[PDB]
Amino acid sequence: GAMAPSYRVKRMDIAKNDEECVVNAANPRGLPGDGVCKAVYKKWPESFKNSATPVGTAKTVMCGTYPVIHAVGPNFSNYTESEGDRELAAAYREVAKEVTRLGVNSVAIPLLSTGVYSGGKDRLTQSLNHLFTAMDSTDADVVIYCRDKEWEKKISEAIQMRT
Ligand SMILES: Cc1cn[nH]c1-c1ccncc1
Numbered sequence: 220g221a222m223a224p225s226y227r228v229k230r231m232d233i234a235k236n237d238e239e240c241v242v243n244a245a246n247p248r249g250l251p252g253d254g255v256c257k258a259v260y261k262k263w264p265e266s267f268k269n270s271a272t273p274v275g276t277a278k279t280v281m282c283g284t285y286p287v288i289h290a291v292g293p294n295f296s297n298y299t300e301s302e303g304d305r306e307l308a309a310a311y312r313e314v315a316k317e318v319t320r321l322g323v324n325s326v327a328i329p330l331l332s333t334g335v336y337s338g339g340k341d342r343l344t345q346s347l348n349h350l351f352t353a354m355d356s357t358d359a360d361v362v363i364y365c366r367d368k369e370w371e372k373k374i375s376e377a378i379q380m381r382t
C-alpha cells in the first residue's frame with residue numbers, strides 16, 4: 220500500500236503516467252478504439268491480447284510486467300440512464316478488485332464513460348463519484364488523468380472538498 224493513500228489529478232496523456240499500472244477506458248471487443256483507448260493501444264499494444272470483456276467488467280493484461288486494467292464503461296447512447304449508472308458503478312468496483320489483486324502502490328485512472336460513451340452529457344460528477352465509491356477502500360495512490368482545463372479544476376475541487 221501507499222504510506223498515506225491519496226487522490227490527485229493531472230491534465231495530460233495517461234500514456235505518460237508515473238504510476239505502477241494504468242486503467243484503460245476500453246471497448247468490450249478489445250479494439251484500438253479512440254481517445255484514451257487509442258493512446259493506450261499505441262503505448263501498450265501487447266496488452267490488447269485477449270483483452271475483450273463485457274460491459275461493467277475489468278480485465279488485466281500485462282505489457283511486459285506493467286499491468287493494463289481494461290475497464291469497460293457503458294455507452295450511454297445504448298443504455299438507459301438507470302442501467303448505464305449501474306454498469307458504470309460496476310466497472311469501477313471491478314477496477315478496485317484488480318488494483319487490490321495486483322498489489323500495486325499507485326494507479327493511473329481516466330473518468331469512464333465521460334467521452335464518446337457519455338451519450339452527449341456531462342458525467343464528470345457521476346463518473347468521479349463512482350470512482351471514489353470503488354477506490355476509497357483501496358490503499359493505492361490514485362492519479363486521475365483528464366485533458367480539459369475546466370475538468371481539472373472541478374476534479375481538483377472535488378478531491379479537496381473531502382480534505
Ligand atoms: C480524457 C480524454 C478525452 N479525450 N482524450 C482524452 C485522453 C487522451 C489520451 N490520454 C488521456 C486522455
Ligand SMILES: [Cl-]
Nearest residue numbers: 333334335336
Ligand atoms: Cl468514454
Ligand SMILES: [Cl-]
Nearest residue numbers: 365366367370
Ligand atoms: Cl477531460
